[PDB]
Amino acid sequence: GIDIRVARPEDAEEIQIIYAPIVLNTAISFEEAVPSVEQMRERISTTLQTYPYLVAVREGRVVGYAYASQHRARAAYRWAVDVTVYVAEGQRRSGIARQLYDVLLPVLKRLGYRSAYAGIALPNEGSVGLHERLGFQHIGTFPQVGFKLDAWHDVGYWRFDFGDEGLHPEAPLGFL
Amino acid sequence: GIDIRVARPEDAEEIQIIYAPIVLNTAISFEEAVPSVEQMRERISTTLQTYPYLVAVREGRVVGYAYASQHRARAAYRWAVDVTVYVAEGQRRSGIARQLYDVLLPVLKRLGYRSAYAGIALPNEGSVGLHERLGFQHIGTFPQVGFKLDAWHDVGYWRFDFGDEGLHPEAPLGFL
Ligand SMILES: CP(=O)(O)CC[C@H](N)C(=O)O
Ligand SMILES: CP(=O)(O)CC[C@H](N)C(=O)O
């Protein structure tokens, strides 16, 4: 009942089940083509080489996942990280989401990142409240920055601060 | 006498001369490695395959350049584009920058983009005023997102709305 494990490439099929509808029918993800199970399988592997990738299991099945990712490419951005959480289309009011974050965030802090950023396609008052009750501060919005499903969607950014200012290179999740 | 030209890889050298010290000792660019002339020569070629790359020439020399680049990776971001302008560290109080934007922006609009974004490392009253008097809206700031030269830097984003809501795929600057 909502236990959080480190993900694995074998969990690709159940992560795709969650992600496929989001891509086809929502503007939650700004992708337009559904990645295959094998494609999701390479993503998980690639991510785990440097970043945490978590899954939330319930009754022995994956009902949610969360992974971190590079914020930007330039060197001076290395203490910044993107965070991404998708719960399965129904077991929300989450819950699963807050928990996935309750594990992902402290692990991020340990590795040395100073800030975490979440992209939230607007409107999504449910997703917004979640982040804001975790401590995320809204720091900006890119209006009409994207076009999907015959509509112009804004993208807002929420920052989670870890603090600090001594500056040493962010270590990676033990290179899986 | 302040003339705006479409860049070509032969301008690589003079582009670096402007850009190399900016990387070494400013927070304007978050690159840490100083790019060579060959590296810059490949960036110009690659950019010109899809995006406009401009230079400002006066007295037969480059005094400012400007280029467009992909804003984000995912498909629904395809009508959004990043903009970058660097002028010569002695020919500023520009001038040059305004003339670059006077050319770059309308090209972008005719290419089918709906919004252009400029990322400004803060503080910079010089660059901020420029964008504000051109029509850019401040849409947010990423606080302490970068660390370089023993200091944490905020990055601001300014948006230039081209308008429209009919949505046809952005065309490239007549590919090389
Ligand atoms: C709108 P987008 O595709 O940029 C980000 C999607 C999701 N919120 C995430 O955190 O990955
Ligand atoms: C403020 P800046 O000039 O470093 C922008 C960096 C670039 N967006 C990135 O991909 O890191």
Residue numbers in the entry:
A (entry chain D), B (entry chain A): 4 to 179
The study reports:
The arsN1 gene encodes an N-acetyltransferase that confers resistance to arsinothricin with high selectivity over the related antibiotic phosphinothricin. Here we show that ArsN1 acetylates both AST and PPT but with higher affinity for AST, indicating that ArsN1 is an AST-selective N-acetyltransferase. The overall conformation is a three-layer α/β sandwich fold, a typical GCN5-related N-acetyltransferase fold. PpArsN1 forms an asymmetric homodimer in solution, as shown by the extensive interactions of the subunits and size-exclusion chromatography, similar to related N-acetyltransferases.
L-PPT is bound in two conformations. In one conformation (PPT-1), the orientation of L-PPT is similar to that of L-AST, although the sets of amino acid residues used by PpArsN1 to interact with each chemical moiety in L-PPT are slightly different from those that interact with the corresponding chemical moiety in L-AST. Another conformation of L-PPT (PPT-2) is similar to that of L-PPT observed in the previously reported coenzyme A- and L-PPT-bound ShPAT (PAT from Streptomyces hygroscopicus, also known as BAR). Superimposition of these two conformations of L-PPT-bound PpArsN1 demonstrates the two different binding modes of substrates in PpArsN1. In contrast, the orientation of PPT-2 is inclined at 120° towards the AcCoA binding site with respect to those of PPT-1 and L-AST. This brings the α-amino group of L-PPT closer to the sulfur atom of AcCoA, which is more favorable for catalysis. Given the shorter distance between the amino group of PPT and the acetyl group of AcCoA in the PPT-2 conformation compared with the longer distance in the PPT-1 conformation, it is reasonable to propose that PPT-2, and not PPT-1, is a conformation that the enzyme assumes during catalysis. The side chain of Asp85 is not long enough to catalyze deprotonation of the α-amino group of L-PPT in the PPT-2 conformation. In contrast, in the PPT-1 conformation, the distance between the α-amino group of L-PPT and Asp85 is shorter (4.9 Å), allowing Asp85 to form a coordination with the amino group of L-PPT via a water molecule. This suggests that substrate deprotonation is catalyzed by Asp85 in the PPT-1 conformation.
